[PDB]
Design a protein around this nucleic acid. Sequence first.
RNA 1: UUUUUUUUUUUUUUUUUUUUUUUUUUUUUUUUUUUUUUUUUUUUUUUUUUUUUUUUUUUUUUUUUUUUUUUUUUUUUUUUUUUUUUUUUUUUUUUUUUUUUUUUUUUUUUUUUUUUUUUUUUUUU
Lengths: 68, 204, 204, 136
Amino acid sequence: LYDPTCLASELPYDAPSEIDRMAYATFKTIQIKIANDQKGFNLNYNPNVTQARLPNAPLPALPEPTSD
Amino acid sequence: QPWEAIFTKDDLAAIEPKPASANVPNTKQWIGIQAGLIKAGATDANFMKVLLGLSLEAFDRGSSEATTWDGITEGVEHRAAANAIKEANCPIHKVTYYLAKPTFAIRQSKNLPPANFAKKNVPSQYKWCAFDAFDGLYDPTCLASELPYDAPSEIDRMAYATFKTIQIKIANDQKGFNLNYNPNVTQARLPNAPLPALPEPTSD
Amino acid sequence: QPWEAIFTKDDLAAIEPKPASANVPNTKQWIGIQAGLIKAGATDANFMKVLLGLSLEAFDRGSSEATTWDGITEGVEHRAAANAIKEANCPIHKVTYYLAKPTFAIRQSKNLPPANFAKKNVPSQYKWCAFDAFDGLYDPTCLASELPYDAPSEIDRMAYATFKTIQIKIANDQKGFNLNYNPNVTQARLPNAPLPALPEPTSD
Amino acid sequence: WDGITEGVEHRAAANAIKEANCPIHKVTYYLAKPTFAIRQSKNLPPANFAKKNVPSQYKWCAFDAFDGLYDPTCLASELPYDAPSEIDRMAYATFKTIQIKIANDQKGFNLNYNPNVTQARLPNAPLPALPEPTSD
RNA sequence: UUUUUUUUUUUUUUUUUUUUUUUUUUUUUUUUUUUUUUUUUUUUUUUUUUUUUUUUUUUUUUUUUUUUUUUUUUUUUUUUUUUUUUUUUUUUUUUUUUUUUUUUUUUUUUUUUUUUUUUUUUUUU
């Protein structure tokens, strides 16, 4: 929506609006979160070196009920 | 004790030194670029012309980013010219720093904002602040026959500082990679182990 | 009890001492510089001339930065002269501190602002505050036949303090490196382990 | 705002203005007087008068491009009413307060980050805290 | 299914210090969950190095042995109320001037009230 090379014969609404842009930044947080959820996967081995780290070992530990 | 002697202002004014920025290729590196770029098919004035092409690419791409960018310029393919820069042991940004102002000047007159503006989530207020080689806009050694707009403006400078945060962030994202081993010592730390843990839903 | 005796002002005034800054090379270190610099091909007045060249380089480069900077001066290559300074066990800045004012004076008269101004993101208001050896502008032992502009100005001094923050930041960036081992004890802490973790997207 | 004019849709024309890197106000500043003159002769007060809570005394003072009424370069074949009047000018200053207020409401937004650095400051964090019932 | 043909020795300590210091014989089980929900959600191809410090300064300065608990609340009330879609940038300064000018060491507390009276009176149009 901001990319100068992006195609566009006519945009009905200025979604690029700065308010929407900061909202898009907030949206980027979503993109980042999911990236952390999937891109954050630790590729610590190629040839199935599960002896170093087991599959799904990167899974976060269950949250404790205590504050600390 | 020569150091105890007074140099005398008359002699100081006779020095007439030149600024020596380190964000520009060394004379021998400029030659190294020639050895590659001229060899690549560029000649004479095309030397700067092709490098300007890359600087324009760097404007929308970056260091190795512009290096990967293809396209035959008035002298030679961007990648080929980029290789020449690499032969000189410099990043494209190094050359771009020297040709930052003319590069910006071109786009400023053609109204061509940085293509990575969107990617960097830079506020529209700072649309022209997303320039990797913005330092060349202030660098006294940077080339510049005429700049259409005073991008150096202090407001833009603080915006450039904000832009620097972007540069820092990405540096943290890539430069922050922990080179804790050379000969594949994964037993000390596994590949991609530096990857940040997934964020928790709790505040603490 | 000689310490109980009154020295008498008449005798105090008879002392006529000289300021003794530690930001300047020791007399023997000045000689060490001569042993290297004169050996490098410099002679007599060229001793100061070449060092001024380096101070000008330090203005746009820095300690080892100016050391890496090449270019044959009126006496010898900057790097060769820099080696002489290193032979004296001093940084180029050490010499530059002594020759800070004349150096600044040269550029001030030639209107040559620091090339690292852009790199340091120093506000244009403080364009001439980006000077590593700015302390020499106040140092009573620093050489100076004539300074075109009173850079020592208190406003500039506080700006120099802000500049000091830059110096501190970079120190934290490099001097802050944790020398937790000598004989490659990576088992205690791995190389580049001190690298700060990547910033999280959350506020906490 | 849409609507096809004698030449083309308002939005399309607005895009042209944006292509020139200008706000519509920029063009309006030049055409402020003729614009006001049209409405003044047609008795068409600003529709945002109500929104801005502008006193009826200053009904014709709610004009964003009022500066064009004084601007020597602004176009004007004939102005039905001297809106530039000093009384209206001070009213325009009061109107400027409106412009300033909205600027504070939107321009006052703190652009403290570019690449989504919400870790420094979260989105909508600049939002003013809810008013307390106490005087202090 | 893939490696060899990749690199060290010749680098440094002993002769440095403890035992002979203290617990058992102190308390729980017989307390509660499963049968609760996700996958099929998105990134890479984004950018830095080559930027600068050391050689700058403290210790040897002062407290403990000073005071509270045993004082009071819950059982009090809201949601179901309203905005967005409103407007700015592209406006201007630095390079202007002071310090080095004067006080402390001058005087009060220990002087007097509460326990006195209104609301329930009238405008907007």
